[PDB]
Each structure stands twice: as C-alpha cells, then as structure tokens.
C-alpha cells in the first residue's frame, strides 16, 4: 500500500486500538477457546488479491480477540504492573517509521539515564552528566542486566587476583568464585550464576524477608574459610514473592570491603523511588557497584525497556540494541515528573486500599507488610483453605491471583497492576473474593 | 493521557509518519551531525509538568531528525534489516494495544503453511495435516541452522551406535565434519563451535556456486582421512554475491553418504514465490532442513525466520503480522513487489554494462548487483570510501576471492528507477575523480 491508504487506515486502527482499550473493562480477561478454533476461520491459502482492511479488522475482533489474555484489563491483579501507556505507543509509531539497529540514539540515551538518574535522586557517582567516570545504560530485562553486572565482576575479580598474582589461570580462579543473592532473590539471578559458570548461594533472610548484615557475614566466612571466594552479590528492592526489601545500608559496607561487586535488583519497585516518600528504601545505593530496574513494569514505557546504572562505565565494557530513549523520552515528556509519581501513588493508594478491606474482616490476615502496591493475605487457619480459596477464584475466571510461599505460609498474592484501575474495580475484587471465602470457610465444617 | 487524547494524537503521528515516508527522497541517508550534538538542545532533567504534544514533534524534526541514520531512504543501497512496510506498522500498532495466547500459537502455524505454498515446497515439508515433516518460525537464520546441526549431530550419533554399539558419543563427535560453500554465512561457523564439530569449507566454482565433483572430493579426502560427514549447508543466495548452490548435484550426494542436507535461503527464499525464481530451489525434495528470511522481500520485520524440516521428530506474536502483511499485499502484490525490485536491479546491471570503466562479477539475479571498477584492488577501496564520505547514498563492499567488490542492492519499499538513476551518475562522477587520483 502507499503512504495515502496508510493514513486512512492508520487512523482507523488508532480509533479501533482507542476502541479496544475505552471497552476494556467488558471482556474476559482469560481467553474460552477449544484447541484448532482458529484455523477453520481463515482460509487454506493467502488470498492471491488484497483482502479489504474492513474484512481483516472484522477478521482481528471475531478471530484474535477471543483467542488472547487482555492483560491491561484492570481486573489482571497477577504478577507486576506490565507497561503500556499511550506516549509509548506513540513513541513506537514513530519509532517504527525511522527503524533501529546513529548518534541521537546514544546521546538521548545518555540524557535519559540522567533523567531518570536525577528523579530517582541517585549518587552522583551513577550519573554521566558532569564528566563522571560512572553512567546509565538500557537493558532488554532485569535478567539480562544481572547478567551483565554479574560478568563485569566476574571479569574485574580476575583481573584483580591475575595482577597480584599472575601465575594464576582463569579456569583456576572461576572453580573458586562465589556469588550470593537472598532466599527470595529472582530466578534470573540463578540463570546468571549458570551462564557465567560460577556458584550461586543464597542467604537466608530474617522474618521481614530481608537480607541482613549478621547473615550475609556468616555465609562470607564459612565460604572464605572453605577457600571459595565472594566476587559478586545481588541484593533485592522489592522481592517478586511479598514485595520485601534487602537491607542495603546494612550490607553495602560488608560487601565494599569485601571486594566484592554489588548489583542492586529493583526491577519492580525501583519506580517508587521517584516519589520522595520511598526514597529511603533505595538508601545505600552509594554502596552499590551497579543498580537497575524496569520501567516497562511500574514506569510506564511500554516493554523492552530495563535500565541499569555503574560507578565505573568501563568496568561494564569487560563484559564485551533498539531506540529505547525515545519512549523514555516521550513517556517523560508527556506525562511529566508530577504525573509518573501520580501514576505510582495511585496504584500504592489502590493498594493500601485493598489492605484495609482485609484487614477489616476478622476472618483474614496481611502477611507481609504493604509498602507498595502488592498485597499479600490469606484467611486466618489451614493452608488448605487457602488452596482452596485460590482454586474457586481461579475457577470462577473473574479475576486471577498468583499464590506464593512464605517459608511454610501459602500465601494469596493481589498485585495492583493496569494502567486503568481505579478504587471501583479494586472493591469489586474484594467483593467476588469475599463471597468465595465464605462459601470455603462453610464446606469447612464437613 | 488518556484515550480521547490518544485517537487524536495517534491520527495527528499517522500523518506525521506518512508525511515522513513522503518526503524521505529528500533527507541524506546519514547523519551529519556529531556525536555531542544533543545534550545541549535538551533540558538538563525531565519536565515537572507535561510538555505539549505540538513541542515534542517539532522538536523531533529539530533535534532527532538530523541525528538520525534513515535506513528507509531508497538511496541506502543495502539490506536494512530493521525495514518495515505500512501493513506491518498496522500490525504493531494493534500489539501494543493486545501485548497463554492461543491465538497467536495456532496463527503462527496456519502461516507457516501460508509461506510454505507460496514458495511451493515439495508436500513433505508442510505441517497442513501431513504429519510427517512441518515448520517453524525460528528467532533467526543463525538459530536455524544450530537447530538443524543439532539434530543432524543426534541422527549420526544414534545412527553409528546402532552400528557399532561400542563407539561413545565423544569418540564419535570428535570426527563429525560439516560442510558449506566457501560463501557460507558467517553463521554457519558459529553453529559449529557451538556444536563442537568441525567445519570444513568446500571451494566454489567460476559461479560461486557448489558442485558435485568439489563435494565428493571433499568426502573422499575426509573420509579416507577417518573423519566422519554429517552435515551439510548449501546455501540459495549467498551473502556475499546473490550465489546459487546446485541442489540438483549436492542433494543426491547428501542422501546417498548420509549427510545430514540443510538448506539455507536466506534472503533470497522469498524470491521463490514467483515461477521465475523457482528453478533455483529444485532440489529441495532432497534436503532435510530449508530456512529463510522473509523479511528481506516480503515486507515483514525479521524477527522472523521461517524453517521446515522434512521430519519433525527429528526435531513476541509475529505471526499477526505476516497475517496482516500477507492478506494486504496478496501474492500477487508481493510477487510484484519481487519483480520489480529485480527490475531495478537489471536497470543498474545495465548502466553497469555501459560504461567500459566497470565491469559486473556475478550473474545479476536478484535485488543485489555485484560490480567494480575495472581494474585494482586499491582503486575500488578508495571509491567505496568517497562513496560513504559523500554521504549521498551507501554501498557495503565484499571479498569475492581476492577481489574487492561493490555491493549495489536494491531493498528499500520506495526505490524507483529514477532514485536508480541518480545514484548511478553520482557513483559514475566520483569515479572518475577516483581514477585520476589514481594516475598520480
Ligand atoms: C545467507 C545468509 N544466511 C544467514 C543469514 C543470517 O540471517 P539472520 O541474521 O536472520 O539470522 C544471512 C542474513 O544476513 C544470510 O544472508
């Protein structure tokens, strides 16, 4: 097709997306279909003419819709806040028109890692604005980031034991090498310890799920003294099982003057940090050697978008693709500042919300403190109630929750995740929930 | 914002973007400005408030437009593997909205076969019922071809054990050989080192293309030698010039001594689906494995690579917009589309032919024209670079042999023969001022 038919065409699939999302609320969040319904509907072979974009639209609402999960349903209470906002898609229009894999690229990438550098208020030591020798940088995901940092310090240890020592070979040193990450730390952290061949231990984590000093030592000398040596450690800002937060400011210093490279993984709750009021779970990035997040969770820059900072840029060249800066970019500019930290408070307001409904029922418990946007409860006695609580909601396929593990608890998981909940939906959840309970807690007397 | 906001924005970049795509004649296809350029037209930190849509487009076109390459120009004269067409920005756009899906698994494989009659493979490699044999849609051609050694590397192993039960797998894979023309991609070595076997080139003939009598010497040598054949990567397209492998002498070679027979389309595969081209894929009956690209010419984005083996126990939603792609063009559309890009090509071929200062290395084709400056090396060398220097279009040169070469390809959705013209004249002027210098 030429320019002039995308624009009539353009347009109409920007009123159908618009369409899709203002109607959102209506569908089954969960798709309803038997295996093969798919094929039938279109036909053996490509069409030899041009279909019409009347037909092929039709075609996407009667065929692909009812075979998708519509995750930006407000009522997807699953997981993290995935993003998807409007400036992001705009910002892929665009994107898709000049293609990508030159220098804007890399300069507006700069400048943006200062952008959002200078909102999560960072050390200067992470920023490349004024000269620094530290920087920012945009990573695919969290995982790929944790590898990255977990290689630069593979490598730099080497480099450092090779120097004092230099009779001493690679495959010699890596057999030795340990790295460390908290109980609740991600699985992408054990994916990294694999790829770059080295073992992984995880610290046992007090009631708070947190990493701490007392801990992360006992673990450091048992494994010096067994001839292993600490090179890399990952600490976690917002655990993905109850939202809980390793204790930086404690194990910061323990890992600085152990030599040993700190990676702060603040994948989803690193977005709070703009707002001044959780600010201070992020206290001891100073001690960090590399800290990242993911704007396409909370951030809302729709996905492929993971940013990572480093003290020392060319430690970060050792390890040896997209124009991700400019959703950034619009995402920035078009929300401002002030609307990004709505955004954030809105969904931890949600949040709190849906806490004190709980609460308020003598009948169900929080289990870990709720300091942003996940809520992690149960109904008071057996786990096997609660198995039972989380089969009924997931059966009935109004909303779906995600159960975790708290040491022996079986826990309920409700996350705050779309960009259009509001207090309404979040009510409606409880309501659905709380009927479901009851019935479980009467098939509890027979 | 919210979703008023967005139909009118979104329609007010529809535009922005067409007009774009309008107007690309006129930008250079490289940026001439330096990297530092940037930071000082931008804010040192983000807005508190939001800044208006009318500020942020304008400043695209003042800040991010010159910084910017435009591989969409018809003046970039390679294969830019991040192109697009409209059908597939239709497609993208509904993907943000959309984002376990059901409908996007069995829609993958209802255009697997799609593709698969389009290009006419023998009934074998279809998945539409047969049962026997299938396809794929791998992340890439590299991904491919790893994919298939690897299940060649399983057959042999399996197969020599049934043979001689004592043989370990390691006394085994130490001996396995590979094979690919001395034009293989790059990714054939890769899937090699990977897969821990050796590879061995085979030299091509005065064509670049694979024949019988360079292979069964290669088998000979080797075999005699104790090595053991296993698999195989005949190539239809070469990277290097457009090359064609002889499936018709290499395939009966490959069934008979057991060796495992991939074949590798890469870009050129797409060009099967016109009866013109199809002659150069006979021979696939005999292959195992048959890969390609079909972002290259038909017009999807590339996170794409079709593969089907002929045997499937051997053995991001990106089918919606090939579906998009492919119910908007038709086949016929997209056979035009082929056409006259080889058109283009036999129209440069010409002006080529026409000048006694040049010559033409490879037979034309497809979309790709190999050529040079009669003559030396070192000529060639300094015409490319004031080529680039210009920055007017650009050219990717190759080693054919010995030989340095200019690689001329028509792959962008708007190069027309005039676009053609000029480029041609352009590269003609700098020519001479080559060949002067050169006298002294
Ligand atoms: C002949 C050939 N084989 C393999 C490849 C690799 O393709 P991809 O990058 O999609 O893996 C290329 C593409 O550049 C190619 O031209």
Not at 93 to 106: N, V
Not at 157 to 177: F, G
Not at 275 to 282: G, M, Q, S, T
Not at 285 to 292: I, L, Q, R, Y
């Amino acid at each position: 097709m030429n320019a002039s038919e995308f624009r009539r065409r353009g347009k109409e699939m920007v009123d159908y997306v618009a369409n899709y999302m203002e109607g959102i609320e209506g569908r089954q969040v969960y798709p309803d279909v038997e295996p093969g319904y798919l094929r039938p509907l279109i036909p053996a072979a490509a069409p030899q003419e041009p279909d019409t974009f009347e037909d092929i639209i039709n075609d996407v609402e009667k065929i692909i819709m009812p075979g998708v999960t519509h995750w930006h349903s407000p009522y997807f209470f699953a997981y993290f806040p995935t993003a998807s906002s409007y400036p992001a898609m705009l910002a892929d229009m665009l994107c898709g028109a000049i293609g990508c894999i030159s220098p804007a690229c890399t300069e507006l990438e700069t400048v943006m890692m200062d952008w959002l550098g200078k909102m999560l208020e960072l050390p200067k030591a992470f920023l490349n604005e004024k000269a620094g020798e530290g920087g920012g940088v945009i990573q695919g995901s969290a995982s790929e980031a944790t590898l990255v940092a977990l290689l630069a310090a593979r490598t730099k240890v080497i480099h450092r034991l090779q120097a004092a020592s230099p009779e001493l070979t690679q495959a010699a040193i890596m057999e030795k090498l340990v790295a460390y990450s908290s109980d609740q730390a991600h699985s992408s952290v054990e994916r990294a310890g694999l790829i770059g061949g080295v073992k992984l231990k995880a610290i046992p984590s007090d009631g708070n799920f947190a990493m701490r000093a007392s801990a992360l030592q006992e673990a450091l000398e048992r494994d010096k003294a067994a001839g292993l040596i600490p090179f890399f450690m990952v600490a976690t800002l917002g655990t993905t099982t109850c939202c809980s937060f390793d204790n930086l400011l404690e194990v910061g210093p323990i890992c600085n003057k152990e030599d040993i490279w700190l990676h702060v993984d603040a994948a989803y709750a690193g977005s709070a940090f703009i707002c001044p009021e959780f600010r201070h779970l992020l206290n001891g990035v100073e001690f960090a050697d590399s800290f990242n997040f993911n704007p396409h969770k909370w951030l809302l820059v729709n996905f492929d978008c993971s940013a990572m900072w480093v003290k020392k840029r060319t430690d970060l060249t050792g390890a040896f693709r997209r124009f991700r800066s400019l959703k950034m970019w619009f995402v920035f500019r078009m929300y401002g500042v002030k609307g990004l930290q709505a955004y954030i408070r809105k969904h931890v307001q949600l949040s709190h919300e849906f806490e004190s409904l709980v609460r308020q029922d003598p009948r169900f418990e929080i289990c870990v403190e709720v300091i942003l946007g996940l809520v992690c409860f149960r109904l008071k006695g057996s786990n096997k109630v609660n198995e039972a609580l989380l089969q009924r909601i997931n059966s009935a396929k109004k909303i779906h929750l995600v159960p975790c593990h708290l040491r022996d608890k079986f826990v309920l998981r409700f996350a705050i995740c779309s960009r259009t909940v509001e207090s309404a939906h979040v009510q409606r959840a409880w309501e659905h929930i709380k009927e479901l309970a009851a019935d479980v807690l009467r098939a509890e007397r027979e």
